[PDB]
């Protein structure tokens, strides 16, 4: 452990982050395959426009949930400036 | 076929490519498990944002090879203003 | 009013945000001239590319020291939730 | 000039294009204004994220502007790839 307050993932949490995990995986090995028969490069850029916005859209939902819970949780609990200095940390690190 | 100008890659192209998608994807799975066995939010989102990170850089690579190769030799054969359109329409693509 | 705790700035902090913001003032109507000039769209575009730049830079910094001092304080004065809401709100529409 | 070919502005396209930067500059100054009364960081941001996005606007549109019709008439003109490799340089150095 070592880090600040989380509420643990429901099954059905799990579940629908999987898929989309799951969908982008696809989306990964689709690209393989058009890079392996020699697809056009635009044909590929655009599914990994695809694959990016699919990332941001899994990530900020990550990001809400983790802010909305477990930090939320975290400032009623006492341990709030320690988590806020955590999300702040990836908030930067996804600006860099 | 119907598009404009390809020049074809090499074993060398695709196998480069293939190892930076590969990796990809390990992230990806890697993600996955760590999501499977509950870990915490901000060690995922890192992650994503390592992920991200070398999706941009393969993204650029193609786009970059795209334009100095094919591109550019549809200038020369005469087909450069299809070949231009099309490369505008993927960046905006990546700002949509 | 009406909003979270905020951190009152300082004489100091007034003045070097004002800088960086006359400076993309500057920057601005620099690229106005440019415009006017009919110079190249290249050269325009470099500049546009300075100004967004010079723009995250001090959106970050605000954001930054918004997080650390005013949203750090609201935690520990017991409206951290009120806060943590609105700087989530800011995130997501940097993201829109 | 020593730069790639150029399809000079109308009286029309600096006009449009100016009253976007002038609506640009006073949300700086109107930022400005903010930062001297002391205005909520949340509040400011908000503009801050708005003035961003009008630049990404006014710069999506040079672009567009350039690359369909003055790269466009290099291509014709058979300096293509030289305005070619300047495209490519402006989009590596939005993405940096
Ligand atoms: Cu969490
Ligand atoms: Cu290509
Ligand atoms: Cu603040
Ligand atoms: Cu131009
Ligand atoms: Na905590
Ligand atoms: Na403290
Ligand atoms: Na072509
Ligand atoms: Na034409
Ligand atoms: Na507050
Ligand atoms: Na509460
Ligand atoms: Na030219
Ligand atoms: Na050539």
Do not use: W
């Amino acid at each position: 452990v070592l880090h600040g307050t989380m509420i643990p993932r429901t099954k059905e949490e799990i579940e629908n982050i999987m898929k989309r995990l799951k969908r982008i995986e696809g989306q990964v090995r689709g690209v393989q395959k058009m890079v392996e028969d020699n697809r056009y490069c635009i044909d590929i850029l655009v599914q990994i426009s695809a694959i990016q916005a699919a990332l941001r859209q899994v990530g900020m939902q990550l990001l809400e949930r983790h802010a909305n819970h477990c930090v939320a949780k975290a400032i009623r609990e006492g341990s709030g400036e320690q988590s806020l200095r955590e999300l702040m940390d990836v908030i930067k690190q996804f600006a860099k």
